[PDB]
Amino acid sequence: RARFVSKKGNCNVAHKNIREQGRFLQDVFTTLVDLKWPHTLLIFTMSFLCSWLLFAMAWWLIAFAHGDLAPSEGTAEPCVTSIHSFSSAFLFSIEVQVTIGFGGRMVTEECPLAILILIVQNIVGLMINAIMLGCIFMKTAQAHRRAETLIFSKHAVIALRHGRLCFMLRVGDLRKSMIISATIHMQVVRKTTSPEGEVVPLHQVDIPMENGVGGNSIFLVAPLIIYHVIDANSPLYDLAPSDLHHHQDLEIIVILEGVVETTGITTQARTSYLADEILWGQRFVPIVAEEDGRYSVDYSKFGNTIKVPTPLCTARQLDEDHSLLEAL
Amino acid sequence: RARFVSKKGNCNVAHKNIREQGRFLQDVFTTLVDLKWPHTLLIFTMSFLCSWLLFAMAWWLIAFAHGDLAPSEGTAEPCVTSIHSFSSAFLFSIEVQVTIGFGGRMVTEECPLAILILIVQNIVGLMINAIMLGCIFMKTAQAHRRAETLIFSKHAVIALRHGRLCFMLRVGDLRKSMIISATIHMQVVRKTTSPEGEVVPLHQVDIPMENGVGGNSIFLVAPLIIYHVIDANSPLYDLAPSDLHHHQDLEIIVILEGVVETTGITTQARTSYLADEILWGQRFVPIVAEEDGRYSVDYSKFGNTIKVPTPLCTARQLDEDHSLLEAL
Amino acid sequence: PLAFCGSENHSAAYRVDQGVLNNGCFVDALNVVPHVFLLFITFPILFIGWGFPGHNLRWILTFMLLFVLVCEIAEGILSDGVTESHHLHLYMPAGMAFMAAVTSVVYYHNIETSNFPKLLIALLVYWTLAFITKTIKFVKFLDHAIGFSQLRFCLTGLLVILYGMLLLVEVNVIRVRRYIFFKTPREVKPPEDLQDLGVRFLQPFVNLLSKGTYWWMNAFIKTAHKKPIDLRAIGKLPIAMRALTNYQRLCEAFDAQVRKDAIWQALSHAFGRRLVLSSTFRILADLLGFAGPLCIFGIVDHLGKANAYVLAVLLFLALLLQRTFLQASYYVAIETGINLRGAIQTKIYNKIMHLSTSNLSMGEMTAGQICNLVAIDTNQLMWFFFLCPNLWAMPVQIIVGVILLYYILGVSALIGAAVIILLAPVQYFVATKLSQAQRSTLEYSNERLKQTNEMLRGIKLLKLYAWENIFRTRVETTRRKEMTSLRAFAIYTSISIFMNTAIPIAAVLITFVGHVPSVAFASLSLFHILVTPLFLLSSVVRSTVKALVSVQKLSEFLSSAEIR
Amino acid sequence: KTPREVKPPEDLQDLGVRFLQPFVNLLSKGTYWWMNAFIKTAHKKPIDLR
Amino acid sequence: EIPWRACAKYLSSAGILLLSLLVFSQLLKHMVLVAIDYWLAKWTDTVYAMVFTVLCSLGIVLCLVTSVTVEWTGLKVAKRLHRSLLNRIILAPMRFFETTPLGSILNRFSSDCNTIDQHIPSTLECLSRSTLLCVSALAVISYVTPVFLVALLPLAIVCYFIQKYFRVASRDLQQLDDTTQLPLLSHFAETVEGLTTIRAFRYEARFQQKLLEYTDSNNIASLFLTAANRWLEVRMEYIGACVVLIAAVTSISNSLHRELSAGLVGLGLT
Ligand SMILES: Nc1ncnc2c1ncn2[C@@H]1O[C@H](COP(=O)(O)OP(=O)(O)OP(=O)(O)O)[C@@H](O)[C@H]1O
Ligand SMILES: Nc1ncnc2c1ncn2[C@@H]1O[C@H](COP(=O)(O)OP(=O)(O)OP(=O)(O)O)[C@@H](O)[C@H]1O
């Protein structure tokens, strides 16, 4: 009995034997973007090191083939001025590819092959530099830094609203930065079965949020309550108190999707509630108060609730007894 | 009695005691993007200064450990050519990291440790440069410059349309640049209460705009009027004239969300109307006229309205008297 | 010019390396690299916002470090006066150290809000670097140095020990918050924010620095200009205000009763540690400030024929710490007074709730004086525990003053101190005399209060029966007795005032005549400083007397008959 | 804080139907650059009272 | 303004000859203190000895007349105050008594006259000696180093502005302290005067909680007071420390460079 999604958005499911291989040479960029910072740093640094050393070996080899390390006779001019050790060729490669070019060690017309090497190293340097910079960009424009500030109470409560027994939960945003088109997809998951008999382990039913329009967008500035009204079409219409417990196959997946204000990109936070975390018969205490010329969202006691009794039977039996009391 | 959102989109709510801390080392980028220009400028400048000075101290210390400041004997060759003062090492660090490299002061093979320092400073320079450039990019691609041009009249009017009493307001876009998928979410907010008794301070009900399709997208080229038809399902169906006033707990939050034409990113403008700004019984005068071979949106007198009487009772009592007059 | 340790070829052959670490210039420069490192790694991540176990120990270390770095800057600038090239390596490292310590302070303060202590361990590596460099400097300073400035040796080892203690603080906070690679953060239960809940007015969330200097109170006053304050515009209590105080007082009275199985004993047993804490502040303060005249003597005699500058600015720093400690001493005591006021009002009110009516109806107590005791007794005890620490503080001060006179210019035949030595009997005598008078003054005040109360109760009766000349002159008699007693009181307090201000000139005269430059006036300066406490002692003893009699009346009231 | 911002009749009081110097600068108010623009259309199109 | 007028009526209760004697006493007293010790400065580089002693004697006798004048004027003012007020009050008609609440008009004899007659002289002499030693030492440190005046001038302006700032804070504060202190005495009068009823209703815990709240309120008000007072204390102290430093530095530089009888240097710095 695992959690489908962790209380912090971790999709707690392993793949175990994908058939095929990955992307030929594009998975490099995607797998590169989302990755721990020091590892990415190290990869780029070591790319620069290998690019420098490779052409360093190249220049050194060229100077040595030109017969330029031994003679120093004064007459024959080098392919590249004043290099006498592999250290020299390495300094030269760094000067070239980093576009520093001090000048004490300089390419000469005496070796057109050396000119080819220069062109090659410049092209490679620009290509690798642009790749590194595009990667560093799309990494520094990363999302899900905000997706951690989007908080959700550890518990969800049900209560009576409009004479109806509706499942609720409070949502929370901690950043003053605003999410755009914030959309809710509450989704109950369990191992359910069709009448014909087929059962699927993680079945998924999009349970609709009760919105005056009916849509799924919200406008979260002050941390509010998301809630579903349990209708005879809702799968939770057979739910009862004391049926919920950490050993009851039941879970409602909560999805929050919107656009970051500063970065036009989209992020998603996930939270889940299995049966026990769904507290029966409570109400989230209002954590907002009219401050002095302001609205005071007391973020303390954020998910703190209050217990309230209720008819301790299914919304099914709710409508049963209600019809029996109304047709009386 | 504060305004939920200012007449200019300011979410006038403080957080006051968030539990946890921020993002470990990613909040740096987000908090960096949206921030006053001179402060960001200064931060980057001072990053470059500290990066230059640190390696300046490094090079100076290396020259001094090599015993290269005192002798000038002519025989022993420096780690780096021709540096004699910390000023020299600082100029050298600037030449290196900015990739200038004049040449009068140049790295030599005599100190492999100096070569390590060179590699280190080049890697750090490229990393810091890419970070600064990614930040400057995602800052210069900033939104909400357009979100200020999306204007909204200081007042909203109600009138009779289709024999029905519908709440209205005019929207305005001042830029010729177009917003894509411009979507409206009018949302009334007050301290309302369920029948069971629970009250929430800033309750939020998405009041649906009257659209021939029913959806919430618009196509704003000429500044038009947004309006809600007040039905028995609308919370405003118990509203009456003279109930509106600046001391009546009432406010309707207006959200505009779309994609900027030039920058594919999304922006959001906010405006709000509490009870008094909701002028009862008026109509926004048509500010458009068929120009000479053109459509003349007289942006002057933009929100200027005209007073019109009306049955001065609730849409509830409207339907009451209407049913009494139709079943007669 | 502006060379690190640069002089002509004689010293241009100094930066040479006959052994790298043997060059003092080299280790001197290396001791700058860490401070540079921190000062430039932390500024950006500080300007991003600007643009916790082991608080007390860390801060004690940091301020001791501050003081000794000031000392080192002084030593450097002094020892640079012998050369003529202004080789700035003597002090520049210490200036970077000053700045780096300040930055460490401000940085950790702004990180303590949202500590990502993996971001805080930058301090770990940094202090390790600084410690390593200073240990290297010290070791190589054992040999290779004349050590003619033994102060250089002491300060070097001193900084080594301070960096080591800082590192130990760092491993302490690490272990407590084991995060670095360990799994258990032992994270938090901070009442400073949590228990506050959003309605509070006090020091705890503020740092020790402001807890000494009232920066938060500066902010609090900041609004009082732009807007008139209001009672809703007011902070709430601390969670330990006047309820835990009352419980502690009841529990300490229970402990004192078990000991028994006056009330001063219970009060002290409940309360004395905070008082001796405020006292300890006062003692450390005035003892430090007592090194004031020494600076004056040094000034004058160093001028007699440049270290007087650094000595004067040393006195400056001394007075800075001096009065920032006087503030601590005073505020702890005024806070004490507030707590005792609340607790005693609570206890008195409980006694009221248990008061027997017959006691009020038939005899001793009238509502007037029963409320007058909490009205005035409490204020007087509050003021007594304002002047509380000074009492235990002055004798320690006066003894050190005498000892210094014996070791300072008045080394022998300073006899004029015997004047103040004989003054303490004069003080105690004026005390007991004021005490003899105070009972009569207080009883006459109470009589007149009973008079006027009773009078203006049925003042219509008096207006009607024309007995107001009669009752008014009757009260005038009481007021005349009170006037006479207060007249003796005023005579005696004027005697105390004159004796107070008169004994210093007596002392200076007797000392300076005892002889038959710096010495005379330095002693006179000390005499100013020593007469400073006496001027306040004048009222200290008065408040002492009044508090004694007031607690007498308190115990008088507490022993009353109770309904049960 | 106080911009003492504006009440410009040059644009506002004009309301969109005007023909004169005020919105034009003193320079054109001496040299009729706006009138140059006004005549500019009189070539491409015959003027009318509307 | 208001303080000038209130203190002027206070001293007006005393004989004008008391104003003369007090002012001459303070001034001559501490100007002789300055004279004797600044002239001891002339001693550090006998006749001067004997007249030095007679200056000491003048100082002591003038201190005695000073303190005696202080006590006697305080007592005379208190006497005139109590008698005149008692007379004018008892002589007021019934409209006042029936209109004005008794507790107020009573408190001015109860605690206000108490405050006056046994704390005014203490505070007045404290203020008098403090301000006069102050202004004297100011003038003297100006004199011994005529350079110091230029440093002194901005510091006085800073003092003036920040102290007016603190006072505009502390007036509102002290008013709040008064208005938070009154309900204590009110609830106590209620507690005692209606004690039997409260015991009957058995609601003692309720009024106990109410008084706990009242006391907490007074305590928080007083803590406001103290925080403010200590903040100003700190600021003024740091001003004084800056003063000391300036004087010492200026004097040392001048003297050792431009000789000036360094005894005067020690004098200014002390
Ligand atoms: N285990 C798997 N992991 C990843 N991809 C798979 C896997 N099985 C099939 N696919 C992909 O899905 C596509 C269509 O799936 P299909 O149902 O044909 O699988 P299949 O060829 O029948 O293999 P299998 O019998 O294992 O399902 C194929 O192109 C294949 O690449
Ligand atoms: N005041 C708050 N500010 C920010 N985040 C919070 C706050 N309270 C709780 N959270 C976060 O929300 C998540 C679930 O909240 P939960 O309802 O468990 O709060 P809690 O642990 O009960 O604390 P509290 O009792 O203060 O609500 C937790 O992971 C927690 O980090």
mmCIF file of C-alpha atoms in Angstrom, chain C residues 201 212-218 221-222 224-225 228-231 234-238 241-242 296 299-300 303 308-309 312-313 316 319-320 323-324 327 330-331 334 338 341-342 345-346 349 352-353 355 357 360 367 371 374-376 379 383 448-449 452-453 455-457 459-460 463 468 472 479 483 486-487 490 494 497-498 501-502 505 509 512-513 517 521 524-525 528 535 542 546, chain E residues 29 33 37 40 44 52-53 56 60 63-64 67-68 71 75 78-79 82 86-87 90-94 97 102 106 109-111 113-114 117-119 122 125 129 165 169 172 176 181 184-185 187-188 191-192 195-196 198-199 204 207-208 211-212 215-216 218-220 222-224 226-227 230-231 233-235 237-238 241-242 244-245 248 252-253 255-257 262 265-267 269-270:
data_model
loop_
_atom_site.group_PDB
_atom_site.id
_atom_site.type_symbol
_atom_site.label_atom_id
_atom_site.label_comp_id
_atom_site.label_asym_id
_atom_site.label_seq_id
_atom_site.Cartn_x
_atom_site.Cartn_y
_atom_site.Cartn_z
ATOM 1 C CA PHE C 201 6.353 43.567 22.020
ATOM 2 C CA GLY C 212 21.483 46.078 24.108
ATOM 3 C CA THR C 213 20.836 48.989 21.752
ATOM 4 C CA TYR C 214 17.078 49.063 21.076
ATOM 5 C CA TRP C 215 17.055 49.106 17.285
ATOM 6 C CA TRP C 216 13.643 47.443 17.356
ATOM 7 C CA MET C 217 12.547 50.190 19.739
ATOM 8 C CA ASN C 218 13.862 52.680 17.195
ATOM 9 C CA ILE C 221 9.165 54.903 17.772
ATOM 10 C CA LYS C 222 9.514 55.464 14.019
ATOM 11 C CA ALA C 224 5.037 57.496 16.585
ATOM 12 C CA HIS C 225 6.032 60.554 14.547
ATOM 13 C CA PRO C 228 -0.453 59.129 17.012
ATOM 14 C CA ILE C 229 -0.130 55.856 18.903
ATOM 15 C CA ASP C 230 -3.198 53.987 20.141
ATOM 16 C CA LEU C 231 -3.917 51.148 22.551
ATOM 17 C CA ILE C 234 0.216 48.418 20.791
ATOM 18 C CA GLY C 235 2.104 45.175 21.158
ATOM 19 C CA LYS C 236 0.724 42.423 23.349
ATOM 20 C CA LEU C 237 2.397 40.485 26.186
ATOM 21 C CA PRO C 238 5.169 37.944 26.345
ATOM 22 C CA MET C 241 3.919 37.957 31.678
ATOM 23 C CA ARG C 242 2.266 38.140 35.089
ATOM 24 C CA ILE C 296 43.599 60.570 31.375
ATOM 25 C CA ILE C 299 47.202 61.042 27.933
ATOM 26 C CA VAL C 300 48.895 63.684 30.034
ATOM 27 C CA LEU C 303 52.197 64.193 26.160
ATOM 28 C CA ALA C 308 48.111 58.954 23.090
ATOM 29 C CA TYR C 309 45.758 59.002 20.092
ATOM 30 C CA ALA C 312 42.160 58.198 23.773
ATOM 31 C CA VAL C 313 40.151 56.297 21.183
ATOM 32 C CA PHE C 316 36.218 56.049 23.544
ATOM 33 C CA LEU C 319 32.885 54.308 27.312
ATOM 34 C CA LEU C 320 30.915 52.840 24.421
ATOM 35 C CA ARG C 323 27.210 52.686 28.744
ATOM 36 C CA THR C 324 25.811 49.974 26.522
ATOM 37 C CA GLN C 327 21.734 50.211 29.722
ATOM 38 C CA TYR C 330 19.232 49.508 34.171
ATOM 39 C CA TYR C 331 16.768 47.798 31.857
ATOM 40 C CA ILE C 334 13.244 48.149 35.447
ATOM 41 C CA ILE C 338 7.469 45.603 36.277
ATOM 42 C CA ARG C 341 4.510 45.125 40.378
ATOM 43 C CA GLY C 342 2.277 42.756 38.444
ATOM 44 C CA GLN C 345 -0.946 43.492 42.464
ATOM 45 C CA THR C 346 -2.150 39.965 41.722
ATOM 46 C CA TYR C 349 -6.081 41.460 44.783
ATOM 47 C CA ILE C 352 -8.898 41.391 48.675
ATOM 48 C CA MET C 353 -11.028 38.612 47.231
ATOM 49 C CA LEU C 355 -10.773 39.868 52.700
ATOM 50 C CA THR C 357 -15.770 42.352 55.566
ATOM 51 C CA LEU C 360 -13.157 46.735 56.663
ATOM 52 C CA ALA C 367 -11.043 51.155 51.267
ATOM 53 C CA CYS C 371 -6.355 51.035 47.388
ATOM 54 C CA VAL C 374 -1.516 49.388 45.683
ATOM 55 C CA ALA C 375 -1.507 52.910 44.246
ATOM 56 C CA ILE C 376 1.643 54.161 45.997
ATOM 57 C CA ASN C 379 5.118 52.658 42.647
ATOM 58 C CA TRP C 383 11.310 52.775 42.135
ATOM 59 C CA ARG C 448 -5.062 64.005 55.743
ATOM 60 C CA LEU C 449 -6.155 61.588 53.023
ATOM 61 C CA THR C 452 -10.264 64.926 52.503
ATOM 62 C CA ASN C 453 -11.853 61.672 51.319
ATOM 63 C CA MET C 455 -14.966 65.380 53.562
ATOM 64 C CA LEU C 456 -15.695 65.361 49.850
ATOM 65 C CA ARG C 457 -17.827 62.227 50.147
ATOM 66 C CA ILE C 459 -19.624 67.492 50.701
ATOM 67 C CA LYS C 460 -23.295 68.440 50.281
ATOM 68 C CA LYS C 463 -22.349 72.913 52.183
ATOM 69 C CA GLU C 468 -16.753 73.654 56.218
ATOM 70 C CA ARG C 472 -11.425 72.629 56.748
ATOM 71 C CA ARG C 479 -1.868 69.301 57.062
ATOM 72 C CA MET C 483 3.911 70.108 56.884
ATOM 73 C CA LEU C 486 7.840 67.068 55.735
ATOM 74 C CA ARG C 487 9.738 70.151 56.890
ATOM 75 C CA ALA C 490 13.265 68.527 53.721
ATOM 76 C CA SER C 494 19.004 69.126 52.093
ATOM 77 C CA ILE C 497 22.428 66.918 49.387
ATOM 78 C CA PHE C 498 24.981 69.363 50.751
ATOM 79 C CA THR C 501 28.178 67.623 46.961
ATOM 80 C CA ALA C 502 30.478 68.981 49.685
ATOM 81 C CA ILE C 505 35.740 69.361 47.238
ATOM 82 C CA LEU C 509 41.471 69.903 49.023
ATOM 83 C CA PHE C 512 46.223 68.204 47.181
ATOM 84 C CA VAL C 513 47.312 69.755 50.482
ATOM 85 C CA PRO C 517 51.222 67.863 36.422
ATOM 86 C CA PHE C 521 44.276 66.473 37.886
ATOM 87 C CA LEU C 524 40.598 65.044 40.572
ATOM 88 C CA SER C 525 39.118 63.379 37.484
ATOM 89 C CA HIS C 528 34.495 63.562 39.713
ATOM 90 C CA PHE C 535 24.654 62.145 43.883
ATOM 91 C CA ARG C 542 15.594 57.810 50.571
ATOM 92 C CA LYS C 546 10.409 54.458 51.944
ATOM 93 C CA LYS E 29 28.571 77.794 42.805
ATOM 94 C CA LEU E 33 33.929 75.019 40.682
ATOM 95 C CA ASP E 37 39.855 73.657 39.036
ATOM 96 C CA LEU E 40 44.388 74.417 39.400
ATOM 97 C CA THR E 44 50.427 72.392 37.485
ATOM 98 C CA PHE E 52 43.172 77.713 46.219
ATOM 99 C CA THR E 53 42.031 76.673 49.689
ATOM 100 C CA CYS E 56 37.503 75.526 48.123
ATOM 101 C CA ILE E 60 31.531 74.579 50.086
ATOM 102 C CA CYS E 63 26.924 74.667 47.968
ATOM 103 C CA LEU E 64 25.325 74.904 51.403
ATOM 104 C CA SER E 67 20.909 73.264 48.821
ATOM 105 C CA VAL E 68 19.206 75.149 51.648
ATOM 106 C CA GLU E 71 14.708 72.714 50.070
ATOM 107 C CA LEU E 75 8.589 73.564 50.915
ATOM 108 C CA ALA E 78 4.161 73.108 48.440
ATOM 109 C CA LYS E 79 2.612 74.987 51.364
ATOM 110 C CA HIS E 82 -1.918 72.901 49.255
ATOM 111 C CA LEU E 86 -7.853 73.386 49.420
ATOM 112 C CA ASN E 87 -9.405 76.822 49.905
ATOM 113 C CA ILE E 90 -13.944 73.765 49.272
ATOM 114 C CA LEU E 91 -15.251 77.191 48.211
ATOM 115 C CA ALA E 92 -16.478 75.879 44.863
ATOM 116 C CA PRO E 93 -20.288 75.715 44.525
ATOM 117 C CA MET E 94 -22.397 72.563 44.347
ATOM 118 C CA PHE E 97 -19.215 68.839 42.908
ATOM 119 C CA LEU E 102 -15.020 63.015 42.946
ATOM 120 C CA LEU E 106 -9.665 64.091 44.913
ATOM 121 C CA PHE E 109 -4.754 66.199 46.804
ATOM 122 C CA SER E 110 -4.214 62.446 47.064
ATOM 123 C CA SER E 111 -1.294 61.805 44.697
ATOM 124 C CA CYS E 113 0.146 67.120 45.869
ATOM 125 C CA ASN E 114 2.112 64.125 47.162
ATOM 126 C CA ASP E 117 5.633 68.107 47.983
ATOM 127 C CA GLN E 118 7.965 65.142 48.202
ATOM 128 C CA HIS E 119 9.484 64.772 44.740
ATOM 129 C CA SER E 122 14.656 66.166 44.222
ATOM 130 C CA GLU E 125 18.011 69.890 42.034
ATOM 131 C CA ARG E 129 23.024 70.545 38.887
ATOM 132 C CA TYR E 165 11.415 63.635 18.205
ATOM 133 C CA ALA E 169 6.788 60.212 21.061
ATOM 134 C CA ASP E 172 1.601 60.249 23.550
ATOM 135 C CA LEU E 176 -1.315 56.214 27.234
ATOM 136 C CA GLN E 181 -3.256 53.156 34.806
ATOM 137 C CA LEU E 184 -6.551 49.762 37.841
ATOM 138 C CA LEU E 185 -7.684 52.099 40.600
ATOM 139 C CA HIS E 187 -11.482 48.295 39.320
ATOM 140 C CA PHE E 188 -9.952 48.284 42.799
ATOM 141 C CA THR E 191 -13.707 45.417 43.991
ATOM 142 C CA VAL E 192 -13.734 46.753 47.529
ATOM 143 C CA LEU E 195 -17.016 43.040 47.415
ATOM 144 C CA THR E 196 -19.995 41.411 49.141
ATOM 145 C CA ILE E 198 -19.118 39.767 43.996
ATOM 146 C CA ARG E 199 -18.677 37.072 46.636
ATOM 147 C CA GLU E 204 -14.600 35.884 41.591
ATOM 148 C CA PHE E 207 -13.031 39.788 38.022
ATOM 149 C CA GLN E 208 -9.702 38.098 38.744
ATOM 150 C CA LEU E 211 -7.754 42.550 36.729
ATOM 151 C CA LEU E 212 -5.070 40.280 35.327
ATOM 152 C CA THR E 215 -2.377 44.728 35.052
ATOM 153 C CA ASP E 216 -0.994 43.229 31.863
ATOM 154 C CA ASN E 218 -0.374 48.702 32.511
ATOM 155 C CA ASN E 219 2.715 46.512 32.273
ATOM 156 C CA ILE E 220 2.867 46.666 28.489
ATOM 157 C CA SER E 222 5.217 50.771 31.042
ATOM 158 C CA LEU E 223 7.397 48.590 28.832
ATOM 159 C CA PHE E 224 6.642 50.927 25.945
ATOM 160 C CA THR E 226 10.975 52.017 29.170
ATOM 161 C CA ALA E 227 11.908 50.938 25.644
ATOM 162 C CA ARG E 230 16.310 53.575 26.959
ATOM 163 C CA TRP E 231 16.516 54.157 23.218
ATOM 164 C CA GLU E 233 19.270 57.136 26.602
ATOM 165 C CA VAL E 234 21.491 55.159 24.231
ATOM 166 C CA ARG E 235 21.402 57.772 21.486
ATOM 167 C CA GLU E 237 25.010 58.630 25.328
ATOM 168 C CA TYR E 238 26.601 58.001 21.956
ATOM 169 C CA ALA E 241 30.938 59.690 23.580
ATOM 170 C CA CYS E 242 31.471 61.404 20.234
ATOM 171 C CA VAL E 244 34.560 63.111 24.392
ATOM 172 C CA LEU E 245 36.433 61.695 21.423
ATOM 173 C CA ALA E 248 40.437 64.478 23.263
ATOM 174 C CA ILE E 252 46.090 66.208 21.838
ATOM 175 C CA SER E 253 46.834 67.264 18.268
ATOM 176 C CA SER E 255 48.887 70.666 22.326
ATOM 177 C CA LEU E 256 51.685 68.389 21.204
ATOM 178 C CA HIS E 257 51.888 70.289 17.921
ATOM 179 C CA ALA E 262 48.700 70.201 28.489
ATOM 180 C CA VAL E 265 44.301 69.327 27.738
ATOM 181 C CA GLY E 266 43.627 66.973 30.617
ATOM 182 C CA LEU E 267 41.161 69.536 31.920
ATOM 183 C CA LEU E 269 39.105 65.978 28.236
ATOM 184 C CA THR E 270 37.959 65.302 31.790
#
